[PDB]
Write a protein that holds these residues in place. Sequence first.
Motif, PDB file in Angstrom:
ATOM      1  N   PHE A  67      -0.167   5.201 -12.545  1.00 51.22           N
ATOM      2  CA  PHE A  67       0.286   3.860 -12.203  1.00 51.22           C
ATOM      3  C   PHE A  67      -0.281   3.480 -10.843  1.00 51.22           C
ATOM      4  N   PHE A  68      -0.607   2.203 -10.668  1.00 51.57           N
ATOM      5  CA  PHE A  68      -0.947   1.728  -9.316  1.00 51.57           C
ATOM      6  C   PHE A  68      -0.455   0.292  -9.153  1.00 51.57           C
ATOM      7  N   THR A  69       0.051  -0.023  -7.961  1.00 51.79           N
ATOM      8  CA  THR A  69       0.447  -1.390  -7.641  1.00 51.79           C
ATOM      9  C   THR A  69      -0.822  -2.286  -7.654  1.00 51.79           C
ATOM     10  N   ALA A  70      -0.724  -3.498  -8.200  1.00 52.18           N
ATOM     11  CA  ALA A  70      -1.900  -4.401  -8.250  1.00 52.18           C
ATOM     12  C   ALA A  70      -2.479  -4.518  -6.842  1.00 52.18           C
ATOM     13  N   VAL A 127       0.818  -1.214   0.000  1.00 54.57           N
ATOM     14  CA  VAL A 127       0.000   0.000   0.000  1.00 54.57           C
ATOM     15  C   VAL A 127       0.853   1.267   0.000  1.00 54.57           C
ATOM     16  N   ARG A 128       0.334   2.302  -0.668  1.00 53.68           N
ATOM     17  CA  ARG A 128       0.852   3.674  -0.547  1.00 53.68           C
ATOM     18  C   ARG A 128      -0.173   4.449   0.279  1.00 53.68           C
ATOM     19  N   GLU A 129      -0.323   4.051   1.547  1.00 53.78           N
ATOM     20  CA  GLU A 129      -1.313   4.647   2.462  1.00 53.78           C
ATOM     21  C   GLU A 129      -0.636   5.027   3.761  1.00 53.78           C
TER      22      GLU A 129
HETATM   23 CA   LIG Z   1      -0.278   2.140  -5.557  1.00 51.92          CA
END
Ligand SMILES: [Ca+2]
Lengths: 354, 671, 673
Positions: C414-417, A109-111
Amino acid sequence: TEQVMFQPGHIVRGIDFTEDPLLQGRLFSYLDTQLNRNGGPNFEQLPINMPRVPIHNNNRDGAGQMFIHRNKYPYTPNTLNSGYPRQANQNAGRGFFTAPGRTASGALVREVSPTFNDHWSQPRLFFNSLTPVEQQFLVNAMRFEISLVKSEEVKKNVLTQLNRVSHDVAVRVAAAIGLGAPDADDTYYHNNKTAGVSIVGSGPLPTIKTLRVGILATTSESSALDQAAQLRTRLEKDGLVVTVVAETLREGVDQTYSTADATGFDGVVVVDGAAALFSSPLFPTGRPLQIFVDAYRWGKPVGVCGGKSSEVLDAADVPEDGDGVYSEESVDMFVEEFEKGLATFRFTDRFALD
Amino acid sequence: SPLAAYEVDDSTGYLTSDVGGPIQDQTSLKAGIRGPTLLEDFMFRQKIQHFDHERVPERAVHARGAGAHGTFTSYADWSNITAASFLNATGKQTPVFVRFSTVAGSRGSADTARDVHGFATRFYTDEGNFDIVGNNIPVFFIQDAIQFPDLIHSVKPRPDNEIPQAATAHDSAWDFFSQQPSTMHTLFWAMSGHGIPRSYRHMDGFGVHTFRFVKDDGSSKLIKWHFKSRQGKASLVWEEAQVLSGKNADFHRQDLWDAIESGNGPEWDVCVQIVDESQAQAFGFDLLDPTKIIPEEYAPLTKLGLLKLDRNPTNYFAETEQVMFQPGHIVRGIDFTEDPLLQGRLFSYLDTQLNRNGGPNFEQLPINMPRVPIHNNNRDGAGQMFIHRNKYPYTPNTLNSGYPRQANQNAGRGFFTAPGRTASGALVREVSPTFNDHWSQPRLFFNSLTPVEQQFLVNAMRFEISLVKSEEVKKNVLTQLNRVSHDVAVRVAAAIGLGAPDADDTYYHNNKTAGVSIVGSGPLPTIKTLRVGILATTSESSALDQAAQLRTRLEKDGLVVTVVAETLREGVDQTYSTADATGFDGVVVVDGAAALFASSPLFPTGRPLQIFVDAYRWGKPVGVCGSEVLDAADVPEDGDGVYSEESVDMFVEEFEKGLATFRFTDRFALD
Amino acid sequence: PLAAYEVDDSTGYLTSDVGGPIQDQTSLKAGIRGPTLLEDFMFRQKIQHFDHERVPERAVHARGAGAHGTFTSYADWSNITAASFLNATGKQTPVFVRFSTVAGSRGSADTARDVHGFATRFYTDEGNFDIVGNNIPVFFIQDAIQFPDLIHSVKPRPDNEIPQAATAHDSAWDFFSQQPSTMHTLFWAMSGHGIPRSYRHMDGFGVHTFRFVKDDGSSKLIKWHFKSRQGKASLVWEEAQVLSGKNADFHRQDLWDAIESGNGPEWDVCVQIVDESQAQAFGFDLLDPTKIIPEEYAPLTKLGLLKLDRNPTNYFAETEQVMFQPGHIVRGIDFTEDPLLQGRLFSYLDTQLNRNGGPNFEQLPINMPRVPIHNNNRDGAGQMFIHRNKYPYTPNTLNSGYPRQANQNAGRGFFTAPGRTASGALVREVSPTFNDHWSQPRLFFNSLTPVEQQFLVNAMRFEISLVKSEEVKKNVLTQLNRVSHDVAVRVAAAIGLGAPDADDTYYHNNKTAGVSIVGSGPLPTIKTLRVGILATTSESSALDQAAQLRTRLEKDGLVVTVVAETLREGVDQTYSTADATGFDGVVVVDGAAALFSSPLFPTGRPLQIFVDAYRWGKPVGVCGGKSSEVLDAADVPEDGDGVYSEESVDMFVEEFEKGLATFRFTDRFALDS
Ligand SMILES: [Ca+2]
Ligand code: HDD
Ligand code: HDD
Ligand SMILES: [Ca+2]
Ligand SMILES: [Ca+2]
Ligand SMILES: [Ca+2]
Ligand SMILES: [Ca+2]
Ligand SMILES: [Ca+2]
Ligand SMILES: [Ca+2]
């Protein structure tokens, strides 16, 4: 000093990291940035960066390579160098090891953790722990800086944040910048305090060695130089750094009035033989008095040594009964009092409060 | 020695970081056993960052090369001719490092490309490092240093596709040669066997430029440096060099390494030609012109001392790759001349080390350090390895008592410019008319070669020029060659189906000069280190016995013997699969192996016979020890350098004479 | 596509870099025979530039060559990936590709035995996307931290820097035998895949499992496979060795020429697609880069066409300076936890600092994207941009909150799965699921034809016979024996050691499609293949025959070289410069039979070209009807497969062209019993 290249990645067995996301990213930055500074990858070879124990590894080449490596099989696993260097780990060779209780779990996560969300309670804890004059100095620093912000929207936004820490801080800051503070928002307000963060409340200094005493004298009166020499001897005995100031240099005089400033001293003493100084082509108009007045305004111990103090103190508008103001004929008695003032360091009664 | 102090031993011990913390380096730190790698893995990042930054720019020229340590020993006190300290006493020894190289190829290109070769020598003298940055050919392509990028762009690969590697056999190179006639002299040298030397040990070194020797009394004389090989002069033939380039790109570096490891370190007499200042224009050309030799008939050689290379490097990158030569590394007793090629070099070599090293402290690398104290006010810069105690690094000072003190002709053994040197005239970007004869000396060189040597040179030109696509460039090439020799132009033109221009006799002459021919330089003075391939078979015990008998004898005589058979076993060094005639200076078939020369999954079809046939074609001594083999190879039994004896001792004696002869040139067709 | 950065010098006067007209041929001197002046700025700017021309070569893959082209999507792939370049039928994206070896430095030979690089940049409308692949689908090692170990062991020994561009030395085989993960890639490199006929005749592989991610956040696991439309072909080793000497530039020249002739090479860009649930379903771990997914388990899906059709203008500026990164990823693709891939992500961003000498390497024309850049990266050496935004921090109000954050839900970020997780201890431990190092090497070996197996055995016999250490040789046999006892026995025979007793733990008889070169059938096209016609100037009829043959062969897209003793109209090359490695087939015109001594070429050269071509498996023949003199001299049987003799030019060419498609006549190579 210029070439020392620090890294939090320089860690040893017995210490480990935590998952603090600020620390985690630092680890990357300090290894990478030394490439910019040094211009090449062998920065750990600079004398200031070298270790004090042997290096055994298969790093090689690179610009500025200072070593001549004897091992011609620098790969692991090898047999052609008999398996050296050997791997070091928790159980062999005193290796670094990651704390073995550490785990991770969850989504990638990027949280931001919600546990990080209280931005205001601890600023308020800190502010509460300062003395009244210390709180004033902090308000005044904010008043100084925020008054230089040109954007009225930014200034309003600053007051919104300050107000979440302390309504009183926001009101007092707002007063200097001609805005109204927003209404109190008490979500994070509290009255708790913590020890050991206040400077003003930390008590007298435990040592006065190295503190600077400026003695303001004159070459006009042989007696003034004699007074300054006697004071120097008595003060130097206790490890104070003494500067005798006069119009011109000569034996026993360290600095001219032209180069002297109150910021060069922790305490200022006028010898009474120099009272007449308190115009010349040798220094700017009013310089001797200005040194004394600045020292007083900035909270420093100040005094007149020799017995005749009214002329100097009156010219400086300094009260003769003030805390951290000294007057004695006796050099011994003067220094004993003055040294207590140096340990007190700042006389905060001289600063106005809201 | 700075090199000893910086040696790092890793024969024992646990792995550490560069700051001495014991670590591991085999598995990344991961969030779980099948998880992603963590940014906090400092072990990973320090190791990979080092790897990612291992490379430095290759040298702009002479990128491909190899080096060794040794010693120079003076034969005499040469104070009568030079103040140079390293030359000031009989027997005085100075450490050296030498790097040999090609010119055009990049750092992974073949040693046996046809090219000019570098021969750069550092003398770590007791009065500072002195470098002689020379080549194996005594003359250079161009007359002014400002033209160097033009020359080098033209010979290096074409810049749209970067083709061809390490070769002048393309349009641009021959365009430049044909438009810039100064190139003719070096071109003839490069097209001779000097372009494809047998080894670094079998070539000479030349300073090229005229320099000055300067005495303590301020007087000067003009000199040329010539390092004369004690191993003899020897070349490859072209077809052999081409095959070698593929079979062993490291041929010359391996040869040098091996000669040193076996206690056969190569030697040169370090010599000079010495002439008076008044003779700068006395020999029919200008001594400031780097396209001209002084014929030995006009000025003999004086032998100054012995150069021997006898120790290999410990780490190639740290020593060979990082050595940074400069003609600006000069010492008291030597000075420059106004040769405009030399003059510009002085600038280039100081500047280019900034590119290679990435910072200004390159003289602090162990291989570049001197062997005497350094006292100067150079400070700071990236990679500063010193901690200077003098806090007042300016002159004049009183606060450091005036130190360091100025050194000059009369103080501190200072370098000084030869005091008789002067300049006069307009400030000009003009070429001296004294430099204008570009053709007479190429003709002198060509005349001095033997007939087969002339054929080889013609054939090198036929080979390269036939690969030039532009008809116009080819015609321009013939125009220039014709000014050197009409016969050369005619013979080259014949291969390319063009007509040579009519004879232009302006620069034609019949003069010859000693010491430039390889073929004419006589048998080699030693055969130690030369390679003998013995072709045997595992199928006959007699064959292996014959090979072992030959080996014993040949090895006591200093030859490097390789026994070749179908498979490895005791006494067999190499399989037929990996063997090639380019690996040997002589080839012997033991008569028990005859059947192999008449299929196997162990080597390519006809490999044993091809080795023998190639060796024969390339002029090597070849023989059978113990008719059928010679018949299969179509090798005449009565041929010069063909041996056939049942007696091993007789065979060894005769074959060894063949190795000294080295090449049997009667096997090559002539126009 | 880089037209805006081109500089033309076809006209005009010489200038400095600041536009002042100057000269550059003679130094400024104090008098005509005087010393050069320091005030000569013309000299110093020119020489300073020359002195600084070089940059560090790449740490690996230093030797290589590149070209521009186009990728065209076959479909709208939105149902498996959000990737914009794949979002519509016929959608075109510019590409640049660089091919390479791995170990050799700059200037080493193209035809060294090695793994090869195949790196592709897609300049997409949502950012540059790089697939940095090789021609072999599996890698030597299982963790990126081991890369310097592998590379130090295969590169030259560091005392003497010997040998160049070769694994045939003690250190490399020491590493291979101590690190058994290397076995799969080793078997590939020892096959014909280590010596491809050209960059056009090899495939490209991403190696790692990656993810395709849909806009809805769902993911699938993929492997990239670029399938050559030119066919698969190799050299034979002895031919490769000769080529390394005769033409070090063979592969780069082949590619350049194919593009210039309008025969730009093509690949189908394909993936194998499998579910996340199948990560361990195939008997190995999809995170392990030493394993292939056999095509029998997961077929290839064709996504689009990659065509290379334009050569660079300046090799240095374009090919040398292209800086690939697997970190150049776009929305719709994601990483996996392959520990080799994971560490690569760090390496390629860092290494460009070494090559470029500063942090603004993405500003070089070849590295620039084809869409706008909006970010707060500022300054650094070589900064080419002049940024207008004077508030380059987030969060800001003074630039109105721009640039905006892009993510799954806004701005096509972009986003990580989002299904990806991690669990467990923080460990420096290898997964036991990675432990089978030998079954797949065996699978590969089993899938080769008998002559192909012989070639692989022979490559190992060649290299291991050059290893000096008897301990290392024994250790190598121990590892080979775990893949195949027969391989170990056959290799051991050449080096005079005994093979260890069979250890059948990992032996099996399974095979897989699509990995054999010899079994891949005839080439689908013979355009660009090279025919050498050996003639003579002595007979006008021989030149006539060569001209007739040339016309008939050129008609079908073959590259024809007529060779004779000397050049003239219609003759391309002399015997002196000709070699069998220059041709895919060799034809002698019967008018030239007498050639089969002269100062114009080495003794026996004409016959040697024909004999070498025969011995290396190429189609060979004599055209004209009189063939016995040539064939008998060459010891070539007239009735041999891939040997042609016809009077009729038309009939000769028909037969010969079938032989060019067959490409290699493998019955000319001896087999172990
Ligand atoms: Ca992400
Ligand atoms: C104006 C430029 C220029 C000119 C005219 C020359 N060179 Fe040079 N040379 C260089 C510019 C240069 C350089 C670019 O500065 C190099 C590259 C690496 C280095 O240290 O200097 C170099 C390298 C170099 C090397 C390799 C040293 C080594 O092994 O590291 C040799 C042997 C020479 N040169 C020899 C010569 C000779 C014999 C020349 C003519 C007499 C000559 N050079 C002219
Ligand atoms: C941890 C280090 C590391 C690891 C494990 C790998 N590489 Fe890599 N690779 C590099 C570190 C690297 C590098 C040092 O970063 C290079 C040198 C030049 C560059 O841009 O990156 C590189 C260059 C490079 C090139 C040349 C690109 C070009 O033409 O410019 C290719 C084709 C590959 N690699 C392919 C691979 C493949 C298919 C791998 C395994 C699946 C692989 N690399 C593993
Ligand atoms: Ca650990
Ligand atoms: Ca060209
Ligand atoms: Ca010769
Ligand atoms: Ca080795
Ligand atoms: Ca094959
Ligand atoms: Ca730099």
